[PDB]
Amino acid sequence: NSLALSLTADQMVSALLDAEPPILYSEYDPTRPFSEASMMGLLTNLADRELVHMINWAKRVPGFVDLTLHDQVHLLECAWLEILMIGLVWRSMEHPGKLLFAPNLLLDRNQGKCVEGMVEIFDMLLATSSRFRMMNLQGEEFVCLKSIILLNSGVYTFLSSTLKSLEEKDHIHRVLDKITDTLIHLMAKAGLTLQQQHQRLAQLLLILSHIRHMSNKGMEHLYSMKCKNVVPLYDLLLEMLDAHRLH
Amino acid sequence: NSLALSLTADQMVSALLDAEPPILYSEYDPTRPFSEASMMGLLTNLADRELVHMINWAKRVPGFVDLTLHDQVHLLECAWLEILMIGLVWRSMEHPGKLLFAPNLLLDRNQGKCVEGMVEIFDMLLATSSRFRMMNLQGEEFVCLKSIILLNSGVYTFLSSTLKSLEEKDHIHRVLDKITDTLIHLMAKAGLTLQQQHQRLAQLLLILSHIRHMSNKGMEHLYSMKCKNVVPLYDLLLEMLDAHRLH
Ligand SMILES: C[C@]12CC[C@@H]3c4ccc(O)cc4CC[C@H]3[C@@H]1CC[C@@H]2O
């Protein structure tokens, strides 16, 4: 029972709002064509650099510092790729058929093909990117999901199975609900019926499964581009990919 | 605008209830020890046989026959492994630390180790299996999720991108919401507050992401056991695994 558990909806929101990270750029080189390695670079490079903030952003979430330190690393490394992606989709909200990676690196399904196996995912992000537009997502709702991912993705599969374990699991859940009261609130504050409020909470959350899915698939891709000596040796990024210990 | 879109909550439910498939058994052979192939068999074998029903169950869902035929195959083959798993978890609800695969094949984390890479997942299902218990899930709620998976998992990533496409996407969504009105209803009918009704809808859905996740991981496992000439050549199962076209 700490901070988070008290904050009024708006409070919750502003916090979440003010806690956001900066929109990076990319030393994008439009001078030369992207190869199944050139872009990969730009991409993995952006990722790596974004992750530094994402970690700081992390601590800024409510109730997140209240978890054990290892657990946070656990949550943080279980949901990152999703966080990168939910960010991307939002970023690319406005410009359909395009993925505003960075205000400088704006790609379309085409460059997607430059890199292998890359295409699919891109479209997966694209569609999600649309489903958001078609829903008229809202910066407030976004930040809610963003954090929700951080808290869900990985909660069930923690690092423990003891008493402090069933406590943490219980905190994360308590925070989560608070986040819901908030979400459901930003909708009353928009004039939705009760029914609409339900239905929208669903609509949103459900997407998250698709994200979970994209995140899963993307990760497989990345691990394959690494087993191809194409991915720059990025300390941080490698660390997050390794946490998944996938094959 | 067909059937589904009308059915009263209960109507929706009973339908969903009556539409359920039978709980299979397994020609389980407790006579001899399971090897990283013996069990695999039992498992993949159960899977294959369950899938026959799951397909029939499918048609029994509302609004599902209203989709194009290819799309249904699409949805059905995009969410199956999840459907098997959400089934399993429910089945194993009552007996913690155990996974009631079939009323005859009841395993624990141990046998899980018999097969390789198998352990992890098992625990993932276990925890989910618990999270359900700790929530006192309800047969009514279950069938709702079950179908919800069928409808979500794969909707965004359909087979088209034309007009009839944006229609189907629009139907599936309309059905989904109806399912939500139902869920939210089975909770009023249980005496939950408004707040509780929100919070629970979340709690449930959110899990679905974990399922999405487990389903993703499991699939990778299965495809690896196949690349190990350990998996029996099961027509149906192979077909579903192939739809994912994973690497
Ligand atoms: C990890 C990948 C490279 C980095 C990409 C990125 C990089 C930065 C960012 O903010 C979002 C994303 C989303 C998709 C990611 C890709 C999915 C497949 C690819 O390997």
Ligand SMILES: C[C@]12CC[C@@H]3c4ccc(O)cc4CC[C@H]3[C@@H]1CC[C@@H]2O
């Ligand atoms: C597909 C696997 C074998 C079949 C298993 C099954 C088989 C039948 C069923 O009703 C549920 C499940 C859930 C987990 C599945 C497993 C996940 C990994 C393994 O390869």
